[PDB]
């Protein structure tokens, strides 16, 4: 059960530009503060984006051929997303990694966990695009969801937080977006 986002629904509104201005690190701004704000922003909007399609994500876990798994060391699509969303919320509000006081800096773990937080958001991007994207089209949301992914992917390339390999399930879409998905 895979669905086709390569049809004329490769229409992205809200993307007059290529996202270069709002993704590029602002000059003289601390690099940690820039990543920390955008990751929180991406999680907040992705959690809300998943909220509209959460009603129709019941058992049927991931996309075709590539099936993600939270079960190994020590689930259906609704289960692993709900746990991942809650987990990112705990880490994103964790003052250890995301301090809100002015003097406190980001720890050494910060760079690695940001890499861990981004990939889960991409994996949550996968199930919705692969299995719950045709309700996005019903709700006329393909304009906002396409631009949200292109912004997210442009953010992944710019700071190299996500490996090229990891984008394999949505790689044809990213290639199709080359004009809006950053070069």
């Amino acid at each position: 059960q895979i669905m086709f986002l390569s049809e004329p629904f490769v229409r992205t509104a809200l993307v007059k530009g290529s996202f270069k201005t709002i993704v590029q690190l602002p000059k003289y701004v601390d690099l940690g503060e820039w990543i920390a704000l955008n990751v929180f922003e991406f999680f907040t909007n992705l959690n809300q984006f998943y909220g509209v399609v959460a009603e129709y994500c019941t058992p049927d876990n991931a996309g075709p051929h590539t099936d993600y798994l939270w079960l190994d060391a020590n689930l259906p699509a609704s289960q692993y997303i709900d746990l991942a969303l809650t987990w990112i919320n705990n880490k994103v509000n964790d003052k250890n990694l995301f301090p809100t006081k002015n003097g406190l800096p980001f720890p050494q773990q910060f760079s690695r966990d940001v890499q861990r937080i981004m990939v889960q958001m991409f994996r949550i991007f996968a199930h919705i695009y692969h299995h719950h994207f045709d309700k996005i089209v019903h709700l006329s949301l393909e304009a906002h969801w396409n631009s949200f992914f292109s912004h997210f992917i442009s953010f992944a390339k710019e700071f190299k937080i996500i490996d090229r390999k990891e984008m394999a399930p949505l790689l044809p879409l990213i290639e199709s977006f080359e004009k809006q998905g950053k070069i």
Binding site: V29, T100, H138, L141
Partner: protein, 90 residues
């Protein structure tokens, strides 16, 4: 196969969409449009403040090390702005 274009038609029906999902979808529309319109607005002002300070500093024939300290002083206050905007309970 090859670079051939594909077009598809959809029922486009928001019917039988459990009411709340229809209302939730309208909320993300407003939030996303407000987010990206403000996101470009934040970045534009951020660049406008820096460039205006840079042209202002070369106007006084300052040493390059003095300009960088002033420009880095802005970036610190710019970084303070990002931490402040990140602090949220919404």
């Amino acid at each position: 196969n090859g670079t051939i274009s594909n077009y598809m038609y959809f029922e486009r029906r928001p019917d039988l969409l459990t009411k709340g999902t229809q209302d939730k979808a309208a909320a993300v529309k407003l939030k996303i449009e407000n987010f990206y319109q403000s996101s470009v607005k934040y970045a534009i002002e951020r660049n406008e403040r820096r460039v205006e300070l840079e042209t202002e500093l070369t106007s006084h024939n300052w040493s390059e090390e003095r300009k960088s300290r002033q420009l880095s002083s802005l970036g610190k206050k710019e970084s303070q702005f990002l931490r402040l905007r990140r602090t949220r309970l919404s």
